[PDB]
Coordinates of C-alpha atoms and ligand atoms in Angstrom, one line a residue:
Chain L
X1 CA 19.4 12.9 18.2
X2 CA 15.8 11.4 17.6
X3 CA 17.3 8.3 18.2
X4 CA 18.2 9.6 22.0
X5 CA 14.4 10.4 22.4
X6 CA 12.2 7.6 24.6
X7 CA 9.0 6.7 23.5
X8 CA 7.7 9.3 25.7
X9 CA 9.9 12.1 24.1
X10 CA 9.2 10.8 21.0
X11 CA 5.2 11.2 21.5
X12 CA 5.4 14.4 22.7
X13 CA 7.8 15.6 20.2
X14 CA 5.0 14.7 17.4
X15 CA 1.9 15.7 19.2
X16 CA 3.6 18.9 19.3
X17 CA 4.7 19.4 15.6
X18 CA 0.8 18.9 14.6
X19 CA -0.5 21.0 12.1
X20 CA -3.0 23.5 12.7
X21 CA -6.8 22.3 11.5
X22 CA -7.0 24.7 8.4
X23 CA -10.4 26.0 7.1
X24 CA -11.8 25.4 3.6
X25 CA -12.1 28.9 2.3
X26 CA -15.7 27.6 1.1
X27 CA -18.7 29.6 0.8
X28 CA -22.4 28.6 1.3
X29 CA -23.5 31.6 -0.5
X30 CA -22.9 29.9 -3.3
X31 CA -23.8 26.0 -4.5
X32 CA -21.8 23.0 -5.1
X33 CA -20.6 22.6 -8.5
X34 CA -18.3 19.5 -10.2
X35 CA -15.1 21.8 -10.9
X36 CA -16.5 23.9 -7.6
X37 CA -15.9 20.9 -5.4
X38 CA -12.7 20.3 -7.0
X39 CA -11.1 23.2 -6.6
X40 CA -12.5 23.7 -3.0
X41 CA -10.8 20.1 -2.0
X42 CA -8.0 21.2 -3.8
X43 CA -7.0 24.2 -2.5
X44 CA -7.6 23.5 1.0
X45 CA -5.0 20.6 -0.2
X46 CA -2.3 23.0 -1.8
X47 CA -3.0 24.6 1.7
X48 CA -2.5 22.6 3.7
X49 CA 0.2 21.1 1.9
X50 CA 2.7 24.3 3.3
X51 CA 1.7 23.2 6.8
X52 CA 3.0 19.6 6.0
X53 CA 6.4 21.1 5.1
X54 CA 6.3 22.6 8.7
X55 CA 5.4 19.6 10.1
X56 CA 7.7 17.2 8.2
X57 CA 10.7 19.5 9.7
X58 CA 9.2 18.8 13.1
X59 CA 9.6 15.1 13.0
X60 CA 12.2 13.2 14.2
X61 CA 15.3 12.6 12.4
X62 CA 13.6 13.9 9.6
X63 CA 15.9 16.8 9.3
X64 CA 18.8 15.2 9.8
X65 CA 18.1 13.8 5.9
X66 CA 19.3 15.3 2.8
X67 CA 17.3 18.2 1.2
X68 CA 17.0 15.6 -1.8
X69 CA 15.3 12.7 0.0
X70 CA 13.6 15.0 2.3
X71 CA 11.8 16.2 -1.2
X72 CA 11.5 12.9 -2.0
X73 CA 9.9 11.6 0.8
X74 CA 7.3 14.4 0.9
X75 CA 7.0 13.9 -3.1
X76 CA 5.8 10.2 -2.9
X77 CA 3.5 10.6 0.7
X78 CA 2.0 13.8 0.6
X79 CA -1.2 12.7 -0.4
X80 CA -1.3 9.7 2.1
X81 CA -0.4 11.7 4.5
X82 CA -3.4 14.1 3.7
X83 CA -5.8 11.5 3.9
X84 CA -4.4 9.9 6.6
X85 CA -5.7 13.1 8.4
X86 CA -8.5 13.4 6.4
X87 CA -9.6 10.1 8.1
X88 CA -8.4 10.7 11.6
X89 CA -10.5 14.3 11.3
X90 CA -13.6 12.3 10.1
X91 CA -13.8 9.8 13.2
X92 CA -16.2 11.5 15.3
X93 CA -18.3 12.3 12.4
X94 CA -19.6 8.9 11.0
X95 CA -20.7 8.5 7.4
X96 CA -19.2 11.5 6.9
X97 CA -15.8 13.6 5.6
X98 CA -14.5 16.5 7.7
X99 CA -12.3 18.0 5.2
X100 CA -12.3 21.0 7.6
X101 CA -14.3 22.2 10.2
X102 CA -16.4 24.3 7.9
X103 CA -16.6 21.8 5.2
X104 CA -18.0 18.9 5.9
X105 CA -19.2 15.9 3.0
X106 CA -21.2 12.9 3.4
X107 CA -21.1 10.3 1.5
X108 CA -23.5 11.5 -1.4
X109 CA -21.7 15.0 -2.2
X110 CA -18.8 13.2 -3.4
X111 CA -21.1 12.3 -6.5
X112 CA -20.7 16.2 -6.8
X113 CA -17.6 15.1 -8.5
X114 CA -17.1 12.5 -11.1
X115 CA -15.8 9.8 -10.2
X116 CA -14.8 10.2 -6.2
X117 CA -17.5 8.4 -5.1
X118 CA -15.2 5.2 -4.7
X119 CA -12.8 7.4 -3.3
X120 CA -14.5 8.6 -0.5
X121 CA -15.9 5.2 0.4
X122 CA -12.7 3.6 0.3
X123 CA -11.8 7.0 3.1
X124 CA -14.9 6.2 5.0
X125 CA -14.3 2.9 5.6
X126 CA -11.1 3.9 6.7
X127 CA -12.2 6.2 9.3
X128 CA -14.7 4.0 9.8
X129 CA -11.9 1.0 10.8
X130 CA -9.7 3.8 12.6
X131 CA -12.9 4.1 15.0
X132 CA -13.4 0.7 15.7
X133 CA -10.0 0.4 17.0
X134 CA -10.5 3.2 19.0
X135 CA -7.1 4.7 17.3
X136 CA -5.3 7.4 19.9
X137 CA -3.9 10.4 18.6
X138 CA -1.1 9.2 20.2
X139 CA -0.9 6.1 17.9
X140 CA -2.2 8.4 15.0
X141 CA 0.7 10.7 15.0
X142 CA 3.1 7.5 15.0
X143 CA 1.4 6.1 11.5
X144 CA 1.5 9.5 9.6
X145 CA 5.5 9.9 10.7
X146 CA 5.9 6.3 9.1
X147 CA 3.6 7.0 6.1
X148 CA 6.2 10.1 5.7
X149 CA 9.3 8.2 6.2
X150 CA 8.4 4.9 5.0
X151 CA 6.3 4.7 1.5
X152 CA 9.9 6.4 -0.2
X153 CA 12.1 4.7 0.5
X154 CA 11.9 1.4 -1.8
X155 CA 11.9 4.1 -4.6
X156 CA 15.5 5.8 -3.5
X157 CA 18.3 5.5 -6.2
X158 CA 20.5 2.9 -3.8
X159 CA 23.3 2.9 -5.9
X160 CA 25.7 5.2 -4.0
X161 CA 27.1 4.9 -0.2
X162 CA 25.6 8.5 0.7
X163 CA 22.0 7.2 -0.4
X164 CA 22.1 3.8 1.7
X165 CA 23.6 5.0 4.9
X166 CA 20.9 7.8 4.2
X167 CA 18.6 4.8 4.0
X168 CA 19.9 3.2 7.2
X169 CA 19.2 6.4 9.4
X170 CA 16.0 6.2 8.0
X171 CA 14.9 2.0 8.7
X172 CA 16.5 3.3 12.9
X173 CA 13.9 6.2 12.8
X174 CA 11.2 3.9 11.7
X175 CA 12.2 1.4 14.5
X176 CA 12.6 3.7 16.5
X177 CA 9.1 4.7 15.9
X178 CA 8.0 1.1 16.2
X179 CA 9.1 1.1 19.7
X180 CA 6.6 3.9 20.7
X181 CA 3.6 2.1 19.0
X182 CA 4.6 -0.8 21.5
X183 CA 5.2 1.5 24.1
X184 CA 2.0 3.4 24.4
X185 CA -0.2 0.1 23.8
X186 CA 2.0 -1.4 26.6
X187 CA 0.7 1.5 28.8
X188 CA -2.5 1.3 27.6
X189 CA -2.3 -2.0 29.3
X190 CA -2.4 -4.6 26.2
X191 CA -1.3 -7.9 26.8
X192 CA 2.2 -8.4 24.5
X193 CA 0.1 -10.2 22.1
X194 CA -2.5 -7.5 21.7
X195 CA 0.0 -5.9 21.9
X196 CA 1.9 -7.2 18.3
X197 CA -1.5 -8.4 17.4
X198 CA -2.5 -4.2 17.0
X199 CA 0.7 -2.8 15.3
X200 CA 0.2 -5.5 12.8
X201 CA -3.4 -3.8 12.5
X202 CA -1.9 -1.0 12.6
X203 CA 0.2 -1.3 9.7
X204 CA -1.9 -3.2 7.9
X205 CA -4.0 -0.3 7.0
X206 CA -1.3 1.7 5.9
X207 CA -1.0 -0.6 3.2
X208 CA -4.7 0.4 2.4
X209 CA -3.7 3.9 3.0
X210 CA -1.3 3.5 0.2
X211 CA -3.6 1.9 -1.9
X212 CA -6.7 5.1 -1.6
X213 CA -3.8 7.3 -2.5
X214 CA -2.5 5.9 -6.2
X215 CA -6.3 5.8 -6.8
X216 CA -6.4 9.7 -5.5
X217 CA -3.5 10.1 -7.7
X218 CA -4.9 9.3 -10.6
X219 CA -8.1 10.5 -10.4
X220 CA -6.6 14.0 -9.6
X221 CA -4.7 14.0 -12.7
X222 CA -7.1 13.0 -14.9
X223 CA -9.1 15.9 -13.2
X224 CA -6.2 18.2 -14.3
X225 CA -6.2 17.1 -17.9
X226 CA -10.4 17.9 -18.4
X227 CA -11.0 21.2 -17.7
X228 CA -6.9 21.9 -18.1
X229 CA -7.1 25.1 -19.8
X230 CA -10.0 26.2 -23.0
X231 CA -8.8 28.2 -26.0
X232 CA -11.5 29.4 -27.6
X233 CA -11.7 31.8 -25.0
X234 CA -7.8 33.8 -25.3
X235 CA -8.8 33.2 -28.9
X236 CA -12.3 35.5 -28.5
X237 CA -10.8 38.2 -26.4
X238 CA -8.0 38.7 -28.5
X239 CA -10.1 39.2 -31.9
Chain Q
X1 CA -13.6 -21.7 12.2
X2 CA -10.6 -24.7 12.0
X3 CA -7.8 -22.0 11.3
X4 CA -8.5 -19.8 14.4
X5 CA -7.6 -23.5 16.4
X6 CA -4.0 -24.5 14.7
X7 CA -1.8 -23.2 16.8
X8 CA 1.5 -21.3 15.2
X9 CA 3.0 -24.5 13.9
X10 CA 0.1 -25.9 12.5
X11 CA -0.6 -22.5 10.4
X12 CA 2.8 -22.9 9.3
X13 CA 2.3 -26.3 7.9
X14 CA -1.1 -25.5 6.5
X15 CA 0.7 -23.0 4.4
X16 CA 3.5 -24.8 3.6
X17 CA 1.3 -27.2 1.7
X18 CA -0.9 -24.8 0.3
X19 CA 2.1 -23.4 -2.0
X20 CA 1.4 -23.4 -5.7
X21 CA 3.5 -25.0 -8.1
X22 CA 6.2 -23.2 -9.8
X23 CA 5.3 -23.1 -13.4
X24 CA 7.2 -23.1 -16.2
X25 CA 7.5 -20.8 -19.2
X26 CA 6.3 -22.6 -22.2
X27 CA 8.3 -20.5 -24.3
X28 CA 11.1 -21.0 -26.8
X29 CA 14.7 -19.6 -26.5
X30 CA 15.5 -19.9 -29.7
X31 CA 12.8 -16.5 -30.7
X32 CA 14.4 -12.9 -29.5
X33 CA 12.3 -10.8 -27.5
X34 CA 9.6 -7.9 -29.0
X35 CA 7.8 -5.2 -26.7
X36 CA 5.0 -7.2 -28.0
X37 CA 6.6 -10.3 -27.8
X38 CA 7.5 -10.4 -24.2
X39 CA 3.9 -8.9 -22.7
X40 CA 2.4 -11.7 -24.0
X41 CA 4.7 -14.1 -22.6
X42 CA 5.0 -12.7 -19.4
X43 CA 0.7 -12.7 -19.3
X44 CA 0.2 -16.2 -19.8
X45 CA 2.6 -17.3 -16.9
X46 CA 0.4 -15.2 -15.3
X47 CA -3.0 -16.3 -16.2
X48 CA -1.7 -19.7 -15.6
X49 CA -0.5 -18.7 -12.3
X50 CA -3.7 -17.1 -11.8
X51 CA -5.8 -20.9 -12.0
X52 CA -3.2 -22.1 -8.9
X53 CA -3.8 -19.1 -7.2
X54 CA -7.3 -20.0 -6.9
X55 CA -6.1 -23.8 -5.4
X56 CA -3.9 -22.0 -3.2
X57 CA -6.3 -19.5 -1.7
X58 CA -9.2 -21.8 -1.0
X59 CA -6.4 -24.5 0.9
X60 CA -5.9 -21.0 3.5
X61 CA -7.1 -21.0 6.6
X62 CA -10.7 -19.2 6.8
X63 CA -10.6 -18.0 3.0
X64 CA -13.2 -20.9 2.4
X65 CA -15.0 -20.1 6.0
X66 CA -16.0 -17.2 3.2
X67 CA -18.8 -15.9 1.4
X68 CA -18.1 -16.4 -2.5
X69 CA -18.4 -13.6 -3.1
X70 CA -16.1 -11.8 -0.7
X71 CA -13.7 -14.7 -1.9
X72 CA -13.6 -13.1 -5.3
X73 CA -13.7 -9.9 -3.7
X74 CA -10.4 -10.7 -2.2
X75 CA -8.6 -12.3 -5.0
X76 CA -9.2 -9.3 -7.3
X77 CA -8.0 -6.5 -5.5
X78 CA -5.2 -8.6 -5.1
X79 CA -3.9 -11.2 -7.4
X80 CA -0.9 -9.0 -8.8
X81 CA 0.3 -8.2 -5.3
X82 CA 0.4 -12.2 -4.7
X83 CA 1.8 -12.9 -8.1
X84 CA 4.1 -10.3 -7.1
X85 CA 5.3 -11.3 -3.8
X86 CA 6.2 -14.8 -5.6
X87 CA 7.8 -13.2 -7.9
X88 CA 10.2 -11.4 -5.6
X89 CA 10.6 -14.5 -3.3
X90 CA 12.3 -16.6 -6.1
X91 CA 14.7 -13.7 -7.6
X92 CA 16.4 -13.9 -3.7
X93 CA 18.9 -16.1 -5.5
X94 CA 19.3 -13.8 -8.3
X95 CA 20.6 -10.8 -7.5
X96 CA 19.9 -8.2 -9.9
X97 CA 17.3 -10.4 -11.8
X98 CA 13.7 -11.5 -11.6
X99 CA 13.1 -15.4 -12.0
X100 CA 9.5 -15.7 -13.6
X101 CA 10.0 -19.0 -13.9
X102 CA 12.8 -21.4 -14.2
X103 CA 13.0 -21.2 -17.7
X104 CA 12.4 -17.4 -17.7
X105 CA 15.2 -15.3 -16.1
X106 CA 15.2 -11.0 -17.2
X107 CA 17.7 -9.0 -15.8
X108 CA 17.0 -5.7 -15.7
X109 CA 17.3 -4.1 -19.1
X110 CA 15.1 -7.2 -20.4
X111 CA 12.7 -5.4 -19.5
X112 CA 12.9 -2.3 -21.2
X113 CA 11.8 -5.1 -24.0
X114 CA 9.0 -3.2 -22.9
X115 CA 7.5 0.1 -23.1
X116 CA 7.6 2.0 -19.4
X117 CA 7.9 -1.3 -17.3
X118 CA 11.2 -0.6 -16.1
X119 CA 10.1 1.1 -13.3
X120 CA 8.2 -1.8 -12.3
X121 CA 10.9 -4.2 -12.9
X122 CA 13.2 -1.9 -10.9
X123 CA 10.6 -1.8 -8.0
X124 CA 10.6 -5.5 -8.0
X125 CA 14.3 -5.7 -8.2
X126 CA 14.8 -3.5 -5.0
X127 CA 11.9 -4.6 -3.4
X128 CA 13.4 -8.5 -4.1
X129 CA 16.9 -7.1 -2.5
X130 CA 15.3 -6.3 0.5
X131 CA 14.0 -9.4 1.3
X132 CA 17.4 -10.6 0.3
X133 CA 19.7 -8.7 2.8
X134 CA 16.1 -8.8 6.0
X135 CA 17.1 -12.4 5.4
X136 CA 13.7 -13.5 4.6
X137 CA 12.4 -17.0 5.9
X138 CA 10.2 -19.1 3.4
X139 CA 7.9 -19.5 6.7
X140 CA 8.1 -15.7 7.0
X141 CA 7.3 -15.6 3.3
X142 CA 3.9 -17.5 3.2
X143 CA 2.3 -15.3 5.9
X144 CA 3.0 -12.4 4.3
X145 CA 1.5 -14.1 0.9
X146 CA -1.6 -15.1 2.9
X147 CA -1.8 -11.4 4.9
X148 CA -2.1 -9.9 1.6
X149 CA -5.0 -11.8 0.0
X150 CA -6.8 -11.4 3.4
X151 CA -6.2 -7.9 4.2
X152 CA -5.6 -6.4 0.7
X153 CA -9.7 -6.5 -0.1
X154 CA -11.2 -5.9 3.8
X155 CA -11.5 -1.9 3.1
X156 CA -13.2 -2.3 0.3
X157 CA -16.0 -4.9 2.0
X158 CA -19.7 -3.2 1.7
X159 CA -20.4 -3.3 5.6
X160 CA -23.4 -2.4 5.3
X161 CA -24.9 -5.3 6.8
X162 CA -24.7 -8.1 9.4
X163 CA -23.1 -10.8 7.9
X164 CA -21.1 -8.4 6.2
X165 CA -19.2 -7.1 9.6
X166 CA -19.1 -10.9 11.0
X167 CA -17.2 -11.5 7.6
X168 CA -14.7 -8.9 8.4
X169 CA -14.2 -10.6 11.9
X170 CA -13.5 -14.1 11.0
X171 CA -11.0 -11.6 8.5
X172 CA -9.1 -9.9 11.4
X173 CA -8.9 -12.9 14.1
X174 CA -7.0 -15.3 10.8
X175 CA -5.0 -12.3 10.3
X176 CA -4.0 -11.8 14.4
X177 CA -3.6 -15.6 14.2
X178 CA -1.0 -15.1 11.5
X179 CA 0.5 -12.5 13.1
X180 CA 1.1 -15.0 16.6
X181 CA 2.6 -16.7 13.8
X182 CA 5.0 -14.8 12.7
X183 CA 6.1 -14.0 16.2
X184 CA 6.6 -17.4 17.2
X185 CA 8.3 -17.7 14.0
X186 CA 11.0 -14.8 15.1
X187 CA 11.1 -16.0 18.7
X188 CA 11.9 -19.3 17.6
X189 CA 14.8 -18.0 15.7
X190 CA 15.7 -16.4 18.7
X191 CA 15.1 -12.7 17.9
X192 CA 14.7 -10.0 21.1
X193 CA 11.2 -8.7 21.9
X194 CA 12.1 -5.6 20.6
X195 CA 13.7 -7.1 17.0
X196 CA 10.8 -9.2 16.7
X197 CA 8.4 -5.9 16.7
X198 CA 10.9 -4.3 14.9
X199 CA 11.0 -6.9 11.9
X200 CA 7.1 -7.7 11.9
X201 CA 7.3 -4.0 11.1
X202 CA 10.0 -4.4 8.6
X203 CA 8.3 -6.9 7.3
X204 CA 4.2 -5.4 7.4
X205 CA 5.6 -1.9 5.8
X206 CA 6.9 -3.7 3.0
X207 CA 3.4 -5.0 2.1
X208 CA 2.7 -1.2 1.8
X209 CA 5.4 -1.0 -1.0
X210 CA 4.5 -4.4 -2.7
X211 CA 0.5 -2.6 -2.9
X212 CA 1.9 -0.1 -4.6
X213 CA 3.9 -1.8 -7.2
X214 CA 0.3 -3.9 -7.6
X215 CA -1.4 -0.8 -8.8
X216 CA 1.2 1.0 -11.1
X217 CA 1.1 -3.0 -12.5
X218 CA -2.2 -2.9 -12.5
X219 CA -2.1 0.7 -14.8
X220 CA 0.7 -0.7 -17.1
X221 CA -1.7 -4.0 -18.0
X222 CA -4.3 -1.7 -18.8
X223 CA -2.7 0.5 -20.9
X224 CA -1.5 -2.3 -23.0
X225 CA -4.6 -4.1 -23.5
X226 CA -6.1 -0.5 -24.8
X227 CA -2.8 -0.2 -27.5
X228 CA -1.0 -3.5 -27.6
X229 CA -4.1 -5.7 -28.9
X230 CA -5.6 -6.2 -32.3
X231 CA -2.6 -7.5 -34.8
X232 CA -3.7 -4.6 -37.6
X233 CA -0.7 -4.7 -39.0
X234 CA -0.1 -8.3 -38.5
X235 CA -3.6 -9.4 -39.9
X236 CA -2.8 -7.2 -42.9
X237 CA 0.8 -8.5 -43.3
X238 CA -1.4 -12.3 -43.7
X239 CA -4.0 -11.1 -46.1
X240 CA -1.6 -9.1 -48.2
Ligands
EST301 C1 -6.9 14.2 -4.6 C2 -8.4 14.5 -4.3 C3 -8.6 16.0 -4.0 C4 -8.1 16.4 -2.6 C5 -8.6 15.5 -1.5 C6 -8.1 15.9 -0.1 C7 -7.8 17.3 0.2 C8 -7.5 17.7 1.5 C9 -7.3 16.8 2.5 O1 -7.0 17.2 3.8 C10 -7.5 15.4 2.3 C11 -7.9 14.9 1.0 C12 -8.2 13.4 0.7 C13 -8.9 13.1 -0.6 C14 -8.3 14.0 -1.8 C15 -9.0 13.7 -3.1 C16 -9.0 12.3 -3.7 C17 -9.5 12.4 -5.2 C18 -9.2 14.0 -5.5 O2 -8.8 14.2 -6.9
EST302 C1 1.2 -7.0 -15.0 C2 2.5 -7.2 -15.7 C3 2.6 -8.4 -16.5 C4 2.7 -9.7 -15.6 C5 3.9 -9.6 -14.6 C6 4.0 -10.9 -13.7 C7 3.7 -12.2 -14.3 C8 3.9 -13.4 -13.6 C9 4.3 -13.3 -12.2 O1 4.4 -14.5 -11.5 C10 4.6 -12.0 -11.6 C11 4.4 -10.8 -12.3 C12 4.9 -9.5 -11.7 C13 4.9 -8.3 -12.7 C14 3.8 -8.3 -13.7 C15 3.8 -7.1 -14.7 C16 3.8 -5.7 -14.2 C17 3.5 -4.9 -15.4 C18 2.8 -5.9 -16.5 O2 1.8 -5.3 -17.2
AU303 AU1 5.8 7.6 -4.8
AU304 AU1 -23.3 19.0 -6.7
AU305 AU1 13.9 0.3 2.7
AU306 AU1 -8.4 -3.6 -4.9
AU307 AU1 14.4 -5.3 -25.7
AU308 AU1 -11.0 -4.3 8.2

């Protein structure tokens, strides 16, 4: 049915099924703290996270997938798709991070944390580049709908007909998709080789996108194996 | 400030020549294949490949218009995606297999010859399929090869100063100029407006998927060169 919508539909459709901005559940009466941080980015993540369910059943033809592969594509994007935001959020705010509207790092704080000062540099720069193409929210919406349908895909188990066709409906959203980007950058008034010229752009920093993500990945499990769970404490309430 | 002149056909050209050459294994066919013995063989290729990777990117238009350092800057955030783009270009004509090199053909199991590098071999595999049935173009396939070493690094670019922002610029006009070319490529093959957007998405998303499979690479290496290293055994085998 998402394959009925015009570009216009199809804008309006995803400008609509944004999430709410959520608020870190942070507190200045206290400081900032390594594992403090951590678990303040964190939650607000596992937070927001629900809303991205809500959202990902907004989006076109996303539905109209397989419980599986729906879980699949959420499993392999979630955290691009967080970021993604993450950046779009920190625009206005240069040199800085607007996790939420309450919580707001610069550069520096991410020291605060070991190791996530490269993250958040690599997500600056982003925002920064997102700024200097004067991204619309219009575009914006378009790129986080790919990043969910797109970055699973390659990883599908295509040996079964169920799992390619499933794959086909897929590729027609994301063209489907495609055609918008042209669409509102035809509007906008770009000549057709700005016009190419900026979904390549466009794309292009998904790839990045992609990249800031397997680093987050890693550096938020390696979070989860230090300070995974102590011992000698159970062990001195017990005796 | 040549490249940003050449007009589609000449940045087609220009890559054309620039292409490597294909290497060979120097391996023998006669000895099995070891976990060990495989990694290794697997890594020279690729620090061989890795010296004509550097005669390749300086013979692409604006990489030498560069600053050294952002040269190297480029190359190492993404050498394994380049390696494997290659790699996936010459398995087209082996469905289900991964040509190496000439001399060097693994199928998939081959590769379990290997502690957890199926996955990898499996993500090259589908990821070589698809370029298989999209039809790929070996004109369509050196842009993409020259996108990724200019574009994979740019992020990561301390724009902190002048010359530093004027860098990234002579960076994004080569990259719009490759994009014309891929255009002009698509028109020429007679592809609708709307199928050439559609395929230069096809075609840009995919880059997305070949970055990842450059950094769960990139964590496989590692991990061997902390455990697979030192003989210890085999150094004791020889003095004992
Ligand atoms: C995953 C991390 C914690 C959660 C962070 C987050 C949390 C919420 C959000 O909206 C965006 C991001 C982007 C960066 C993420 C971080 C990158 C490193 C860290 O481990
Ligand atoms: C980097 C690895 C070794 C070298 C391999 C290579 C070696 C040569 C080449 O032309 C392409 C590739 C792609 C996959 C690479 C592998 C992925 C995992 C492994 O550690
Ligand atoms: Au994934
Ligand atoms: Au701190
Ligand atoms: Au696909
Ligand atoms: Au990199
Ligand atoms: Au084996
Ligand atoms: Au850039």
């Amino acid at each position: 049915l998402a394959l009925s919508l015009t570009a216009d539909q199809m804008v309006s459709a995803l400008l609509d099924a944004e999430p709410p901005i959520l608020y870190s559940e942070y507190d200045p009466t206290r400081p900032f703290s390594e594992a403090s941080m951590m678990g303040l980015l964190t939650n607000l993540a596992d937070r927001e996270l629900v809303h991205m369910i809500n959202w990902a059943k907004r989006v076109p033809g996303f539905v109209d997938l397989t419980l599986h592969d729906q879980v699949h594509l959420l499993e392999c994007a979630w955290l691009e798709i967080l970021m993604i935001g993450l950046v779009w959020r920190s625009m206005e705010h240069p040199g800085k991070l607007l996790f939420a509207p309450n919580l707001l790092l610069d550069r520096n704080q991410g020291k605060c944390v070991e190791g996530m000062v490269e993250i958040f540099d690599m997500l600056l720069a982003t925002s920064s580049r997102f700024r200097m193409m004067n991204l619309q929210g219009e575009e914006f919406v378009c790129l986080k709908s790919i990043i969910l349908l797109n970055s699973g895909v390659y990883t599908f188990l295509s040996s079964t007909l169920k799992s390619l066709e499933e794959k086909d409906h897929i590729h027609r959203v994301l063209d489907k998709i495609t055609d918008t980007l042209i669409h509102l950058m035809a509007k906008a008034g770009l000549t057709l080789q700005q016009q190419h010229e900026r979904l390549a752009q466009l794309l292009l920093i998904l790839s990045h996108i992609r990249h800031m993500s397997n680093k987050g990945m890693e550096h938020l499990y390696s979070m989860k194996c230090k300070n995974v769970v102590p011992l000698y404490d159970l062990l001195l309430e017990m005796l």
